[PDB]
Design a protein around this ligand. Structure first.
Ligand SMILES: NC(=O)C1=CN([C@@H]2O[C@H](COP(=O)(O)OP(=O)(O)OC[C@H]3O[C@@H](n4cnc5c(N)ncnc54)[C@H](OP(=O)(O)O)[C@@H]3O)[C@@H](O)[C@H]2O)C=CC1
Ligand SMILES: NC(=O)C1=CN([C@@H]2O[C@H](COP(=O)(O)OP(=O)(O)OC[C@H]3O[C@@H](n4cnc5c(N)ncnc54)[C@H](OP(=O)(O)O)[C@@H]3O)[C@@H](O)[C@H]2O)C=CC1
Ligand SMILES: [Cl-]
Ligand SMILES: [Cl-]
Lengths: 317, 317
């Protein structure tokens, strides 16, 4: 008999309860939201699925073999005291990648084509032809070339954009100029539409700021460059986005993530011209997908195969 | 010395005058907008570039070898009395195809992802996550599989949509179910998002009507099906689009073309929920592109090679 999987995830508790009815069917689960588990024995527990876990979890479950993040991010876990030296697996919803690429391509097209203007005129019953350059005249600079960035690059290229990429270690991608960490300024100077698909680490906290926006290409085919972020909200400085749009440093933005979520009602972003807001719904997983992922990794682990999507502790993502 | 090319195109006359300064540089042009050409001798004229030409042009220029349409469409020419039995070449701006595909993919994504709702909530400072199915769950049915439709199909497929096509003669396209003329009802019943890329002919006049909209798939992943048209406006019955959206037969629409252009200020379409209007600017040619196209076809013709993009007179497009 395999021991049940420990689950401590701060999502809709009623939703989690329901998924867990059919998850882990060979072993069951220990839902830490249930008061009947306040004094549960975790001595045999092998696997823990955690999202914003209780601080003393690792004292209670000292024999864990693998930690599974309940999210795509691991900032919620990585900084915890007493985090054991065991693999931490991030949630890579293999079906979510394509949905992030739908969002990225749509946002880039809406900026390329002038959706903001089209919609403003439509609401005023104004017939107003706009000029847009073809995609090939515009360079999209993708920051982050991991699971999400490499899919976005591929699809943006097919739509016709010139695409360049930036990552901590330079990638090799056919047809796409790619840059190392240290080449940030050069990469920004070539970029008309910046697409952010970075994890949140100390190095990427407050990264998208006034100074960065002033380095984007100023004499490109869109007139003024555009900032797009669907990575993590704490990577950007929103007051600097607001100032940059008002002063014309940025021609617009598309944002799915924010420093504080939900975005405050009084944020200036909501009504800023040429700014598109989605409420962190660009690529949210269907509720079972996390559990299917964890189950699959357990199966690999129990056949003696390598875990996938293991984070690099020293790098922080 | 080759004779100058006859040009009778009802566009901005000042714009046409300017392009013609550098066009046809080995022979010149005869601009019929110029009053100095009211009594010009066209006995030697070989080529005519026409958009909504004068009715007696063919009496004045009886020795024409080739007619070039000034537009992508040829409805403006095809019905004319005394139209000579010589090739008519349509304007296929080889660089416009990719721009039509940008528009089609953007519109399909905006309907897939709920841009209308996102934007409505954003304007009200409301944080409101929406559910959207992945593209693979939605079938886009492309009507017209010519230069524009085949490019749209390819790019929609890469974005992840299921795609099917319909044309007068069935095409063979790998990975895409394709249907013949007579299979329209079956094709409509499988379609969640209809994309119209048909020419205007008698058979396609008033084609997109109430009866057609009621045949689109009703139990699909978008809930209610969507109508998209960027072919010709006279192919649709706008009052039926309005009724279909109000009654819930259509979940929304995207339109670049209209029965009467510009779209009347009082049209209900402007303010209809889930309807996106662009003012016939999805794929408008840069002003020189027409002349470069005509020049290239003349060069082929003068080397004894076949003209390209010749219309099928019996079929009407
Ligand atoms: N808005 C949303 O709904 C969602 C947002 N996300 C967010 O997207 C992020 C990216 O996801 P994913 O692509 O799967 O992540 P990956 O870990 O696969 O890729 C991360 C990329 O970021 C690069 N990177 C990390 N740190 C730096 C740095 N300091 N300098 C330069 N490049 C850096 C990495 O470089 P290298 O390749 O050299 O390692 C890599 O290319 C996630 O961490 C998550 O926060 C995820 C899902 C949904
Ligand atoms: N909104 C805009 O700015 C623009 C609009 N357009 C419009 O787009 C139209 C399509 O352009 P393009 O793709 O280059 O044209 P093509 O002539 O290359 O293709 C036309 C397609 O329509 C199909 N078709 C024609 N009549 C019928 C019919 N009765 N039943 C079923 N299918 C039919 C043809 O079938 P088959 O393959 O069997 O011949 C073909 O697949 C143009 O005619 C023009 O009016 C063009 C450019 C810009
Ligand atoms: Cl964040
Ligand atoms: Cl029309």
């Amino acid at each position: 008999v395999r021991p049940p999987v420990l689950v401590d995830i701060k999502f809709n508790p009623e939703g989690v309860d329901r998924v867990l009815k059919t998850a882990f069917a060979d072993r069951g689960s220990i839902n830490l939201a249930d008061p009947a588990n306040r004094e549960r024995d975790f001595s045999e527990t092998e696997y823990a699925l955690l999202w914003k876990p209780d601080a003393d979890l690792f004292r209670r479950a000292p024999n864990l073999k693998v930690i599974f993040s309940g999210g795509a991010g691991v900032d919620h876990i990585i900084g915890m005291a007493g985090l054991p030296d065991i693999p931490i697996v991030r949630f890579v919803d293999r079906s979510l990648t394509t949905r992030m690429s739908e969002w990225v391509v749509m946002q880039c097209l809406m900026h390329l084509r002038g959706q903001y203007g089209h919609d403003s005129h439509q609401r005023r019953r104004e017939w107003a032809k706009l000029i847009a350059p073809e995609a090939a005249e515009v360079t999209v600079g993708v920051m982050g070339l991991g699971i999400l960035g490499q899919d976005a690059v591929a699809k943006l290229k097919v739509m016709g954009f010139n695409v360049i990429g930036w990552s901590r270690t330079r990638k090799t991608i056919e047809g796409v100029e790619t840059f190392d960490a240290g080449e940030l300024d050069r990469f920004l100077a070539k970029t008309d539409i910046l697409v952010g698909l970075l994890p949140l680490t100390p190095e990427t906290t407050g990264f998208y700021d006034s100074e960065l926006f002033k380095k984007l290409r100023r004499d490109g085919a869109l007139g003024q460059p555009v900032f797009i972020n669907a990575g993590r909200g704490k990577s950007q400085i929103e007051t600097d986005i607001v100032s940059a749009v008002r002063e014309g440093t940025l021609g617009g933005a598309s944002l799915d993530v924010f420093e504080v979520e939900p975005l405050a009602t009084d944020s200036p972003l909501w009504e800023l011209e040429n700014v598109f807001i989605t409420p962190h719904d660009a690529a949210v997983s269907e509720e079972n997908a996390l559990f299917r992922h964890v189950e699959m990794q357990i199966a690999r682990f129990e056949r003696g195969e390598p875990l996938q999507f293991v984070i690099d502790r020293a790098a922080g993502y």
